[PDB]
Amino acid sequence: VNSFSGYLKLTDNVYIKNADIVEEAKKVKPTVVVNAANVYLKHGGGVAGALNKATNNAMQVESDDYIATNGPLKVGGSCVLSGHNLAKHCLHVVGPNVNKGEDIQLLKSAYENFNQHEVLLAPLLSAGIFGADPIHSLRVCVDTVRTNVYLAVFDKNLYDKLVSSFL
Ligand SMILES: Fc1cccc(CSc2ncnc3[nH]cnc23)c1
Numbered sequence: 634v635n636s637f638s639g640y641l642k643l644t645d646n647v648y649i650k651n652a653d654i655v656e657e658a659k660k661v662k663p664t665v666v667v668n669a670a671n672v673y674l675k676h677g678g679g680v681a682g683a684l685n686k687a688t689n690n691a692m693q694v695e696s697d698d699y700i701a702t703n704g705p706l707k708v709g710g711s712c713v714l715s716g717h718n719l720a721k722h723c724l725h726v727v728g729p730n731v732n733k734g735e736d737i738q739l740l741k742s743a744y745e746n747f748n749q750h751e752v753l754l755a756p757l758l759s760a761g762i763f764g765a766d767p768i769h770s771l772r773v774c775v776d777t778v779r780t781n782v783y784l785a786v787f788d789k790n791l792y793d794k795l796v797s798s799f800l
Contacts, residue, residue: 636661637783643799646781651792654756654785655687658719666716667755670725672705679762688717708735709742731764744777752781771795
C-alpha cells in the first residue's frame with residue numbers, strides 16, 4: 634500500500650492520472666520523481682523547467698555541479714540526484730528529443746532506467762516539448778517498465794485520449 638490517490642490502473646504495474654507532476658510530487662513526497670531531462674541537465678522548460686522552478690532553482694545548481702564533474706548524460710541514460718522539496722530522489726532520465734533528430738528507439742532504453750526503482754512518479758518520456766507521440770510513449774512504458782510507475786499527465790485532453798485509446 635502506498636500514498637498515490639486517484640489513479641486509473643492500466644496494468645499490473647502502471648497507473649495514470651491527469652495531474653500536475655509538481656503538485657503531485659509536493660503532495661505525495663514520493664521516494665522517486667522522474668524528470669524529463671536533457672543530456673546537459675539544463676532544466677529550462679517542460680516538466681524539467683517546472684520541477685526546477687518548484688525547487689527555487691536548487692535542482693539546477695545541483696545539476697550544474699553534477700555536469701561539471703561528470704560531463705553530459707547519454708540519450709537514453711539517467712542519473713539519481715536529490716529530490717529537494719519534491720521527493721527523496723529525482724531520477725533525471727533523458728528520452729530522445731524528436732525535435733533534435735534523436736532515435737526514437739532510444740525511448741525503450743530511457744524507460745529501462747525506471748526498473749532500478751521499485752516505485753516512481755513520472756511523466757511520459759519524450760512527450761510534450763520532446764516531440765514524440767504520447768500514445769507511443771505510454772505503450773513503450775507499459776511494455777518496458779516492470780516496477781510500479783504512477784504516470785502524471787498534465788493535459789486533461791491528452792489524458793482522456795491516452796485512456797480511451799489504451800489497448
Ligand atoms: F500545464 C500545467 C498545468 C499545471 C502545472 C504545470 C507544471 S508540471 C508539467 N509541465 C509539463 N508537462 C507536464 N506533464 C506532467 N506534469 C507536467 C503545467
